[PDB]
Ligand binder design. Structure first.
Ligand code: SF4
Ligand code: SF4
Ligand code: F3S
Ligand code: F3S
Ligand code: FES
Ligand code: FES
Ligand SMILES: [Fe+3]
Ligand SMILES: [Fe+3]
Ligand code: NI
Ligand code: NI
Lengths: 634, 634
């Protein structure tokens, strides 16, 4: 009964193949882990010194307190803070990589890279206060890259990728509570210090530190999107496909998996050059497909089809047709390196700090990107040749996907209804009830939740209640694989008011039809695009973000990055649903801060709800409360 | 049977008082924690994503692998790496605080602070390559503080507080393996990234990252010592006392506890001004005493007596005579805030990122240090008044302590035997066998080990075998409280060869007697002083550190900081004993790297040995192997 594992039919088909072939999957490893430790599940475990491990019984008798005296409050808050810091370390490390790549490009040290989006470069410079008049583009970009790198450490200004991206009124609220980050890596290190043994031991103080570190994560996300748009182009609407049926038995199938477009973007361009080399090997060409966020990056910019996402990533290999899986970092199940010996896939790592035992490592250097890409793709071609005559089982299952909804693209689409006040048509339809509010779906799948079940269940209820739904990361992946990015499904999925708006915008954009039911705003760093849209709406309305009828849902969250994103969503003022249990329930005081008293600090708050129908009701109630606070009908 | 808890008689006496008074201690909380989790003890637990908690059975059947596919190797190495990063975050955060204090002082923004050690300032500038000729001291110091802050982030040079403090041959070895840190907070963040889910998953690669992050920790330690010496004076030999008998019933007893001399040094100076204000309240004066590293800082510089250390810190409060405990950060059991309601002690926090629920917080700002110190001390005076007429139980137990052996002071002492080649008398006596080798004792006590039993057992065996013993942190605390810093105990404790050398040096220093059996080199950051001494010996000999008969022992380690120090001791080339089990035994491959194959990378290696007699034998064997490698008798 594979429907309990994934709601995606293509994944179900590959689970049947993996089972008959004896290939262990993430779901099998989860089953073998049950029952999981109740101390860890509730957050009541600490290993922060060698007197541990310490634990606290959720209920009953001793142990009641850690060996050093750490209470349940402290232990829970310290663990949570470390998870936020780890997420911030990932999103911002990605951004740092892109900042160094941009610097190299404009210094003449990496000619495979360039300023592709001159408009984005100039806007970012203007947002940061960097002068552009009479300056060469390469000098403007050098100053932007320098500013990006400076935000990682203390200096005479706070993190500009926070203070220049949120409205002044929100910055003032955050500053009053000491929550503006001083430097991205500075805050990460301060979290690791304050949570080490014998340091911070006050739950409120620890959690305020966590909120501030979550804003360091936001800055890394926003910096990542800004720099990737400069280097690779700001997305605009594009049509493609998703799910395993995008693999082609007669092509060299190459998955790009991981996170950074510095790698996946070059793979895409070089693969086109090597088409004739692929044909010589008996393929039709090189079919690049996406997994996880780096797949989202090349889908959003180039229309590269998405193969799969998150928890089901091993299933692409089980088809037998995946000739290469090209990795950089984050969210890659290390099982891929062993499964590859059963499936024939060549798994290739490329980043010095992210290797997997048993995978081939091909160092990638931006200074040699094209040559390193050809080396990698030639391994894929050789692998295609090795499977000559082997049957493959690619599920013949795919959906149509309209994506590429950057904030610039959303504003442009709306400008066709109101050229000089593009946000007004959206606001008009929020006021008249055709749009009840906005919900951002973000984050991962998680093996504890039947894959995609929370995303689709919640999305369907919100869409029927006229909520404008936007999505990023593997939430966008879930929704695309279930048809939520195909405009042909607007009639079935959308309430009448929402359908009217999607249709009006689409017809003004010449489509003869509507925008898709859900707007794909990109990768996990591109949650920063949703911030840009929400901040622009707040600024246009003259209100702070905690008065807007906008919510977020990390409906199947997994990674430390998703915890960090959820936390900065709360910190900027949003009601934020999480559909899995974070390790907080072992402390009622911590849970009460994160779900209730934080409202009095930032206006946002977590909504912890594992039942998706109930979560949808709670998200609708949060939206409707905001509408009432603005004096609107609901 | 309190001897199973601590070998310190004063601690035993206070344990009896705490038991009859019903005051729960760290030992009681440990007992309540037993049996501790075997997954955590062995390192085979992972909570790095919300699919967890994951665990791996050390032996037997499933679970055998984490849900994402993470092996035991990966899980163990990732946990270890996070501990190193957390330690680095603490030592280097301390150093960053001091760098900002020095900058403020010389900019005229904090007149309670100043350049006290002009000689140290100029030497550091010369070591770093900063010009001094024709420059004002305040400008030289501004450049030193700027250089310190720059080492936290990437720049055009690597971390100078690594590359300028180790010999070029060692830097070359480390560079060849990619182990030189690029920036202190940069490496901390990169560890948190690479150890997050779906990133680095190769044990060797992860551990190389850990070694590099341990060098970021070394840089933070060395920077902390350098800056504290500039601001507060480089230590020189001083005579004082240790143990609870240094408390005085008729004085206002104030403990400084935590880490940074930016706080404890001002408390010491202001307390002297407030003597008459204390007498008005009926005290004889203010008796400042030390706990943990900040106590070591003021002991080394000012001869402030040490009250207690590490695991036994609560016992100072149990006397009933501790009027205030002034805290900044690190290694403070948060139980102190609750015990204070039973003992009457005023526990005061002072740093924004290190608060304890139930303790009074008095913000300390360097710009207002004197006024903030008087506010704090007036709380202590009021507390002294409240205990008028209450009996106290101060154990009448103390030892004499000769300390203050900075590397400068050791070189000066040796220069009395050879003025222009001060290291030669030490080397001469290593060659002739009067000194078998050198052992650094470092790190914490740990409730799992009867307090001080490993430090004293190992030290006694090494001293009888003519090993020169140096000590820092709570290893120095253990040895001082058991008489190892009293020169009257040289005859009892030291082998004939070592006694001869300690006597020759002491008599050349006008003492009419020997140096003490163990040389106190200061706080935990002052492990960097041992590096300076060992690097100077290596440079004088023309060999790398991994050929010297020098070892280290973290005989009762606890904190993540101690893991980081142990790891950089291995990385710079030392055989390094740890006397508690770090969470590594669940992976034989990881254990084999850390105890064996790392020898081929750095020349150092861990010696994991919980039995102290056996650990002493293993340390002696390591020393003697080094002697043989140099062609010396042993
Ligand atoms: S920090 Fe405290 S609670 Fe955590 S392992 Fe150490 S003694 Fe236990
Ligand atoms: S990172 Fe892997 S091993 Fe760790 S909790 Fe997540 S699924 Fe389990
Ligand atoms: S790329 Fe990773 S952070 Fe979550 S959204 Fe997808 S599993
Ligand atoms: S101050 Fe702390 S790091 Fe260990 S050496 Fe003492 S318990
Ligand atoms: S006791 Fe299971 S997570 Fe630590
Ligand atoms: S299962 Fe006990 S430390 Fe996690
Ligand atoms: Fe992602
Ligand atoms: Fe210390
Ligand atoms: Ni994500
Ligand atoms: Ni220490």
């Amino acid at each position: 009964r594979q429907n309990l594992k994934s709601t995606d039919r293509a994944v179900q088909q590959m689970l049947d193949k993996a089972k008959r072939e004896g290939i262990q999957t993430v779901w099998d490893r989860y089953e073998a882990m049950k029952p999981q430790c109740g101390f860890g599940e509730t957050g009541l475990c600490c290993r922060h010194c060698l007197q541990g491990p310490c634990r606290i019984n959720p209920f009953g008798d001793e142990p009641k307190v850690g060996i050093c005296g750490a209470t349940a409050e402290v232990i829970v808050a310290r663990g949570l803070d470390r998870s936020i810091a780890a997420g911030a370390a990932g999103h911002s490390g990605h951004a740092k990589h892109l900042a160094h790549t941009l610097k190299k490009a404009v210094q003449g040290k990496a000619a495979s890279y360039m300023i592709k989006d001159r408009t984005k470069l100039h806007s970012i410079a203007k947002r940061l206060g960097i002068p552009t008049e009479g300056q060469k583009d390469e000098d403007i970009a050098l100053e932007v890259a320098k500013a990006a790198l400076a935000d990682f450490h203390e200096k005479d200004t706070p993190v500009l990728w926070v203070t220049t991206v949120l409205p002044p009124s929100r910055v003032k609220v955050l500053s009053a509570h000491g929550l503006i980050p001083a430097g991205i890596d500075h805050e990460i290190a301060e979290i690791m210090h304050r949570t080490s043994m014998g340091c911070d031991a006050d739950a409120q103080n620890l959690l305020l530190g966590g909120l501030r570190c979550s804003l360091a994560d936001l800055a890394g996300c926003y910096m990542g999107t800004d720099l990737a748009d400069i280097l690779f182009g700001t997305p605009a609407p594009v049509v493609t496909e998703s799910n395993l049926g995008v693999l082609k038995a007669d092509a060299v199938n190459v998955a790009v998996h991981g996170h950074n477009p510095v790698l996946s973007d070059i793979i895409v361009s070089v693969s086109k050059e090597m088409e004739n080399e692929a044909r010589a090997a008996g393929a039709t060409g090189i079919n690049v497909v996406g997994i996880c966020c780096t797949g989202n990056e090349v889908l959003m910019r180039h229309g590269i089809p998405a193969c799969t996402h998150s928890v089901s990533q091993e299933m692409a290999m089980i088809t037998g047709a995946l000739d290469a899986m090209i990795l950089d970092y984050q969210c890659i199940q290390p099982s891929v390196a062993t499964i590859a010996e059963c499936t024939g896939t060549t798994v290739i790592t490329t980043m010095e700090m992210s290797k997997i035992t048993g995978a081939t490592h091909v160092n990638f250097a931006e200074e040699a990107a094209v040559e390193n890409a050809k080396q990698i793709l030639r391994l894929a071609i050789d692998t295609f040749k090795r499977r000559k005559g082997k049957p493959v089982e690619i599920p013949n299952i795919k959906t149509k996907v309209v994506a590429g909804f950057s904030t610039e693209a959303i504003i442009n689409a709306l400008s066709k209804l109101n050229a000089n006040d593009p946000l007004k048509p959206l606001i008009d339809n929020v006021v008249n009830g055709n749009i009840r509010g906005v919900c951002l779906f973000a984050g991962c799948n998680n093996v504890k939740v039947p894959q995609d079940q929370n995303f689709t269940t919640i999305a369907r209820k919100l869409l029927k209640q006229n909520v404008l739904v936007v999505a990023t990361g593997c939430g966008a992946g879930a929704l695309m694989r279930h048809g939520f990015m195909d405009p042909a499904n607007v009639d079935e999925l959308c309430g009448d008011g929402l359908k009217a708006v999607l249709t009006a915008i689409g017809e003004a954009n010449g489509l003869g039809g509507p925008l898709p039911p859900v707007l794909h705003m990109g990768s996990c760093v591109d949650n920063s695009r949703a911030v840009a849209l929400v901040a622009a709406l707040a600024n246009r309305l003259g209100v702070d973000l905690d008065r807007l009828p906008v919510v977020a849902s990390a409906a199947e969250a997994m990674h430390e990055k998703a915890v960090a994103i959820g936390t900065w969503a709360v910190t900027i003022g949003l009601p934020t649903h999480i559909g899995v249990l974070p390790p907080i329930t072992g402390s009622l005081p911590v849970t009460q801060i994160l779900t209730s008293s934080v409202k009095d600090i930032t206006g946002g708050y977590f909504i912890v709800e594992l039942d998706p129908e109930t979560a949808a009701d709670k998200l609708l109630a949060a939206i409707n409360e905001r509408r009432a606070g603005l004096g609107l009908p609901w």
